[PDB]
Design a protein around this nucleic acid. Structure first.
Lengths: 335, 108, 306
RNA sequence: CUAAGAAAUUCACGGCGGGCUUGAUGUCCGCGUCUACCUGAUUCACUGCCGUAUAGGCAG
């Protein structure tokens, strides 16, 4: 009857590292191998209470008694130095390959049916729509999350590393490439074919991505903020902790990964957002709203069962999304 | 199990004569199988219920979110080795660590 | 078990998110079983194609940086987590705490087989490094060293030396190469005789108590600390059986239906971190598998050490 | 075939108000640092001459 496997699991392809950030001056960014790092330091902030009243305590007495007791914090900031106007974010990317085979499967019948379906997809049309959009998200610096929103000029350099040295150098201007359109460029197609050859083959493909952002002298950069619970006691507790790998601020690896998977423009709602990240039941945690609900037949699970079990091959955009979920990885399975 | 059914466990967990009540119902004794009874068959049914809490219920299974790990046998082939969380071990080491860290005999 | 005819050295490996929860009782460096499983996956993937048998690992751990944070006003530590995606309704998922850590280990894997004379040593070391570059070690991506100063290449030391002087020379040339780290070995007879001494002091003693005593730091009345020889740590030393072995297609929701399943549980032994020149023999210090499946006891250790 | 396989912490913030730290004090007696050596391993790849030459030769 070809029932679904009870255990399904895919390894994460497109594996990025922790994006270190450093600082320096623009127009000597070519010799940016010995730039010093951006360090996370504490600063103490205070202010009054700004949020809305709970409507039963609106009286002026406790209002003025509340603005005479400001809250006191100790936050972390990461600032550029006062003699540098460029933020240099650099991380390494591995495109692994073998993007169809599950890392765990109960049924061998489900396994070779799914492998046949993935092979049917890749010889019908290879990874050339997905790798185009992955090369877009590496081209326009979407991995610079809040570090992008006011920059004068962003330039992204991607160098494909061979066994020991740079096999092919790219150079982009991330502000000329928008955050919502996936057009066609020559170097974008060359990078997309490199990611395609990575995703199809068996060996890994290593990429080094550098992103310079010309913000300004001494402005604030924004690394990842560490999710900690059970924080402690209010005399010594810190309110906001930034990520730091080895005394140097850094964006988390999964934040870079969530930036690179922003290719999903095929969700049924209107694209006032544009592309979102690829998730089963595609949910935007900044929006708080889970698109691709299971009541419509456009989530990942039902699309995969219709593509493998009962062989209803959906629209080519939806199987692009399905193979994007398979490159994303995941742990699927009922009881 | 269900936390609202914890009354059965606190019912069986007492030490009434010299030992545990489940330890009484597990062994065939003249004091057992008669105190919670006026007829023998309903006592047999109640005891056959009460002794079965210590047994695994259903077919053996580990979920997809449970861990299971190939181990290479010396000749060839593998075993699957699904491990579990030892809660008696964590509770015993937890009691020993709480004694060594917050105990009065150590604080002295 | 088997003396390796060659001792191949994987260089410093950068691993970015390793599972720092080694066991339900220990956090810290990942389990030795992770490294033995890594070399068995290496054997599974290229050890067949090159006609070799990769067996045993030398763990080194040059650099360790755990992603922890001490909360204010407590002595113990907590873990920095990751943000899960939402469910299908928009509520947050219930968080499961998984510890991450950034490692820097060097792997001394012992290779023996008929493939030593078929290929050059540098070619088989290069091929096994290209296969290691696309794997994961304890749950963490192996960072493949791009655009740094210079990549560290491999070195397959042939253990069969022409002289004992030549053997000691090439061993010293390797020990200089993996020097800033700290090799990890298993010391179980030391735990056994410590159990003997503690049961001489007070009877009915568990060796869980002996492992706890060799883990902690403890003061004695005349106040002075009690000395411990070296850097003793507790480590998970393999698995022990709970259920009898089941048939391969019998357990519901297995990882595979061709392989028998058995519900197991951890075994906590004692390890030690030594400097690598202290052993004076690099042919040992490799971690092997000891199954003996009929009694459970799927466990790892290092024989030939002392 | 690795307690295997998956994951966006994030938006905002006024820490400033002010101040006398002072007085007083013995560091101090004594002392054997000797002993003996090649800085030289070609250690100054120099100065000039013929030749248009950097190509090549020559002198001390």
């Amino acid at each position: 009857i070809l029932s679904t496997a009870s255990v399904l699991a895919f390894e994460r392809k497109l594996d990025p590292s922790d994006a270190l950030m450093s600082a320096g001056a623009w127009a000597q960014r070519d010799a940016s191998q010995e730039w010093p790092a951006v360090t996370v330091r504490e600063k103490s902030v205070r202010g009054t209470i700004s949020n809305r009243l709970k409507t039963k305590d609106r009286d002026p007495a406790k209002l003025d008694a509340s603005i005479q007791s400001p809250n006191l914090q100790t936050v972390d900031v990461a600032n550029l130095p006062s003699d540098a106007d460029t933020l240099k974010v650099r991380f390494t990317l591995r495109v692994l390959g073998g993007a169809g085979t599950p890392s765990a499967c109960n049924d061998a019948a489900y396994r070779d049916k799914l492998l046949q379906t993935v092979a049917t997809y890749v010889n019908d049309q290879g990874f050339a729509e997905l790798a185009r959009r992955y090369a877009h998200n590496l081209a326009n610096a979407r991995f610079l999350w809040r570090n992008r929103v006011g920059a004068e000029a962003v330039e992204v350099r991607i160098n494909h590393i061979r066994q020991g040295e740079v096999a092919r150098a790219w150079r982009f201007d991330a502000l000329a490439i928008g955050l919502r359109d996936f057009k066609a460029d020559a170097e974008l197609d060359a990078l997309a074919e490199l990611i395609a050859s990575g995703l199809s083959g068996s060996g890994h493909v290593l990429l080094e991505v550098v992103a310079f952002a010309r913000i300004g002298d001494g402005q604030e950069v924004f690394p990842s903020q560490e999710l900690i619970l059970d924080k402690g006691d209010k005399k010594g507790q810190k309110s906001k902790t930034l990520y730091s790998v080895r005394d140097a601020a850094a964006i988390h690896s999964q934040k870079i990964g969530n930036a690179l998977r922003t290719i999903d423009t095929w969700y049924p709602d209107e694209d006032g957002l544009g592309p979102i990240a690829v998730e089963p039941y595609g949910s935007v945690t900044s929006q708080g709203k889970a698109y691709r609900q299971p009541k419509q037949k456009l989530d990942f699970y039902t699309l995969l069962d219709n593509w493998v079990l009962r062989d209803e091959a959906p629209a080519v955009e939806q199987q692009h999304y399905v193979i994007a979920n398979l490159i994303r990885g995941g742990v699927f399975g009922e009881a | 199990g269900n936390a609202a059914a914890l009354d059965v466990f606190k019912f069986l967990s007492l030490q009434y004569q010299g030992k545990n009540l489940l330890n009484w119902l597990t062994e065939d004794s003249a004091e057992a199988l008669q105190a919670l009874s006026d007829n023998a068959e309903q006592a047999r049914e109640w005891r056959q219920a009460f002794i079965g809490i210590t047994t695994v219920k259903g077919a053996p299974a580990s979920h997809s979110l449970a861990k299971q790990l190939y181990f290479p046998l010396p000749g060839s082939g593998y075993h699957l080795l699904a491990p579990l969380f030892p809660t008696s071990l964590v509770h015993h080491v937890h009691a020993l660590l709480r004694e060594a860290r917050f105990g009065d005999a150590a604080k002295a | 078990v088997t003396d390796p005819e060659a001792l191949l050295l994987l260089p410093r490996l950068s691993i970015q998110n390793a599972n720092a929860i080694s066991s339900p009782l220990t956090w810290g460096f990942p389990s030795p079983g992770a490294f033995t499983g890594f070399v068995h996956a290496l054997q599974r993937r290229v050890g067949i194609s090159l006609d070799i048998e990769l067996d045993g690992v030398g763990i080194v751990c040059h650099r360790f940086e755990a992603q922890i944070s001490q909360p204010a006003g407590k002595r113990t530590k907590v873990f920095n987590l990751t943000r899960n995606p939402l469910n299908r309704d928009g509520s947050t998922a219930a968080i499961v705490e998984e510890g991450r850590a950034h490692l820097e280990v060097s792997l001394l894997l012992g290779v023996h087989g008929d493939g030593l004379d078929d290929h050059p040593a540098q070619e088989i070391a290069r091929q096994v490094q290209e296969q290691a570059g696309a794997m994961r070690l304890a749950g963490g991506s192996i960072l493949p060293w791009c655009n740094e100063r210079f990549p560290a290449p491999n070195a397959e030391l042939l253990m069969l030396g022409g002289s004992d002087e030549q053997r000691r020379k090439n061993q010293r040339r390797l020990t200089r190469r993996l020097l800033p780290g700290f090799a990890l070995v298993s010391r179980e007879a030391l735990l056994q005789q410590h159990l003997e001494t503690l049961r001489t002091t007070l009877p009915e003693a568990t060796t869980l108590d002996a492992l706890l005593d060799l883990c902690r730091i403890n003061f004695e009345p005349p106040w002075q600390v009690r000395d411990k020889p070296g850097w003793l740590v507790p480590i998970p030393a393999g698995y022990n059986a709970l259920s009898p072995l089941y048939l391969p297609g019998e357990v519901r929701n297995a990882r595979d239906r061709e392989t028998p399943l058995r519900f197991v549980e951890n075994l906590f032994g004692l390890g030690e971190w030594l400097s690598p020149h202290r052993v004076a023999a690099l042919s040992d210090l490799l971690w092997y598998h000891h199954a003996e499946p009929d009694k459970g006891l799927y466990r790892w250790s290092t024989p030939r050490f002392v």
